[PDB]
Amino acid sequence: SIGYLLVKHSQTDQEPMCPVGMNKLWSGYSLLYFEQDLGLAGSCLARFSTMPFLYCNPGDVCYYASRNDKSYWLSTTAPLPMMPVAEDEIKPYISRCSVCEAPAIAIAVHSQDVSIPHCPAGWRSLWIGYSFLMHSLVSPGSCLEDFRATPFIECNGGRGTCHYYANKYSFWLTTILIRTHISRCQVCMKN
Amino acid sequence: SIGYLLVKHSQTDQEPMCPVGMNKLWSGYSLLYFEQDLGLAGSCLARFSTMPFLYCNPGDVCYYASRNDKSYWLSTTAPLPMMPVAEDEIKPYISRCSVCEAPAIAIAVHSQDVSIPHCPAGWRSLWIGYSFLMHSLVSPGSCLEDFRATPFIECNGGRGTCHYYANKYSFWLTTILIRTHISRCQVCMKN
Amino acid sequence: SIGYLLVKHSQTDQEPMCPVGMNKLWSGYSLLYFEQDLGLAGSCLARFSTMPFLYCNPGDVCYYASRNDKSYWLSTTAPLPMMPVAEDEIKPYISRCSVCEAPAIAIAVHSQDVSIPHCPAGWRSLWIGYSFLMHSLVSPGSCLEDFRATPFIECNGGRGTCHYYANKYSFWLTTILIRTHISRCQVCMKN
Amino acid sequence: SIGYLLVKHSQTDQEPMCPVGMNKLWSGYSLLYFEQDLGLAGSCLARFSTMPFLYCNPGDVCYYASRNDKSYWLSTTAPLPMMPVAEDEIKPYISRCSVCEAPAIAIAVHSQDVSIPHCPAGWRSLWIGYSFLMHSLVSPGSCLEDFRATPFIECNGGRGTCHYYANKYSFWLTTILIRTHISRCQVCMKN
């Protein structure tokens, strides 16, 4: 690929630092989609919002797009309380991200084992993580620093509330106590 | 991306100048589609036409493709009169564009605020605008210089008339009097 | 684009020469598809064949894929006789092509006029032609050297016969005696 | 293309060596898909597994994704016995692969003949093979070193068994005793 843009997701409420030798392009919040690849720049939205769009009928009457109320975001490691959270108190539980100006290609390598796979000779390790596949394994988006059973949250703009999201189509790669059965990965960049 | 071609839309009846250090490849009119990304070269058509195609049956009989009569274009800032306009008088209301030979990558950054987002260190500002998302935020096509409630017009080739177009699927990014609620953006290019 | 491969279609029964400074990668026949972009390498097939595939059931029994009998090819300028031609006598009417190792980007520019559009400053003209759009205008595939009312032929492998093809979806760009109404184009390459 | 990653499939139970001047990125097993292009890095999975995914409901209960039990792999040249094989004894019959860090572009050229097509002047031969097209001819994935009537096997995770797979949509290119009718190819890389 020619992914000059590398996206780093912290899975914490702190903005991740870009690796040395890369310009931060921008920072924000870890977005999956509004009703995509975590390695693409679209996965990093500057400001958290559950209702970010505005529709305009032919004339001065413009309203907030409120039909497709749902949005999906990468969560932090900090456990969500056992009760749905209002959108005003949800930010602490949303992952932060940065977009970085990679000068070379980055790739994710996966072990399907408890051992971290090695970076190729002459390539530099950017981070290590757990193998995650979404509805592409070579992409950096498939390598999340922390394992979470339910890594995403769903928010309802109209309902004003948020909670963990049971995705039917996205899985973790296994090995061939629970973290001991998840495949490990490393994101590597060529010098 | 490897978008060597940068498209600039003026939203006026004047052809925009390519930024210094870029060859103009060609100029024309701001096309959305005939019955796409504003950042791609296909969005800039050399000459305005509501019926640009020709079909040829097996033999000398060739006719003008007249079934799918509708075309869609980016409008100028100048208000369209309160009455549909004949295709012969529509040109003043169609945006002009230029295609420019970018030597480096360009990206749009978005604030979701009244403040303009900053270009990354060592990158040069090309233009500033308002955040527009169509049925990709990293693309320069998402950053239009002027905000317009209804930014597009629809033309009917058979009906020979044109008017503003209420798109169901395309929105403006909001902030998290009307221009004060639209997200600002800047298109930036690396040196 | 990063189309290092440039495809040249002769619309004659002679193989076109690659432009000076480009390696011929290979030559062959101008293929549209078997039951695509003329600018891509897949449009140039080494040897003409109406039945090029072989299917193998689990075992030694392998047979010729004969269900989807139809293939589509770019024709030469030489008129096809007024009577369907057997597949053994069709080669003279099939366009030849070459694939060339472009060192820089090539683009098609279109005038929507009788005048040839100019190449950008510092770019070199590769060929001139007529604007053709298929079911992308920036691509070299949209610029064919000769205008033909029905530019393609259809061949039936089982029926063993070939004739001109009336495509419902592909058109010529017009201007805004018949050649006088077709848009002109030039394929240009940067130095 | 900008396929910096070249995938080499051995069609044997031995890992292929990357060509001289290319870093091995990783090695593994020749995967088609789980219920793609053999030239892409996704076709090379580090460890063989018929059930590689893990699903997690909202809570501590995580289970093995067992609904879409089927996986598809490139086989070795060694004949599979005339009786379905248990998944524990299948590895010897699965092709191995390596992913290599190509510094230049690689392409497959095809003859549609018994003769090997020549590499372009100044390009180096990487391997020779037989022309294979799947449900793209320019890609290295279309050139397999060994011809096999049924080149793939299907495995059933729940059924725990594996056997050859009759693909309806994938074919061999022909010429215009059985190997004598299959098109030859060569994968070539520019210096």
Residue numbers in the entry:
A (entry chain A), B (entry chain A), C (entry chain A), D (entry chain A): 3 to 37, 45 to 144, 155 to 195, 213 to 227
Structure paper excerpt:
Basement membranes are extracellular structures of epithelia and endothelia that have collagen IV scaffolds of triple α-chain helical protomers that associate end-to-end, forming networks. At the C-termini, interactions occur between the trimeric NC1 domains of two protomers, forming a hexamer of these domains reinforced by sulfilimine cross-links. Recent studies in one of our laboratories revealed that the NC1 domains function as recognition modules, directing the selection and assembly of α-chains into protomers and networks.
The asymmetric unit included two subunits. Following application of the crystal symmetry, each subunit formed a protomer with fourfold molecular symmetry. One of these protomers was isolated and the other generated a homo-octamer (α2NC1homo). α2NC1homo resembled a canonical hexamer, except for an increase in the number of subunits to four per protomer, enlarging the equatorial circumference somewhat (∼70 Å diameter) and widening the central tunnel (∼30 Å). Therefore, the two self-assembled noncanonical structures of α2NC1 or α4NC1 subunits may lack some structural elements that are present in the canonical trimeric protomers that could intrinsically restrict the formation of protomers with more than three subunits. The comparison between the structure of the α2NC1 domain in its noncanonical homohexamer and the same domain in α121NC1 (α2NC1α121) revealed that there are conformational differences that might explain the greater number of subunits. The presence of an isolated tetrameric protomer that is not associated into an octamer in the α2NC1homo crystal is structural evidence of weakened interactions across the equatorial plane. Our findings of noncanonical assemblies for α2NC1 and α4NC1 homo-oligomers and the structural changes observed in the chains forming these noncanonical protomers in comparison to α2NC1α121 and to the chains in α1NC1homo, α3NC1homo and α5NC1homo could imply that chain folding is closely related to protomer assembly. It is unlikely that α2NC1homo and α4NC1homo could represent stable physio­logical assemblies, but the structures of the individual chains in these noncanonical oligomers might provide a frozen glimpse of transient conformational states in the process of NC1 folding and hexamer building.
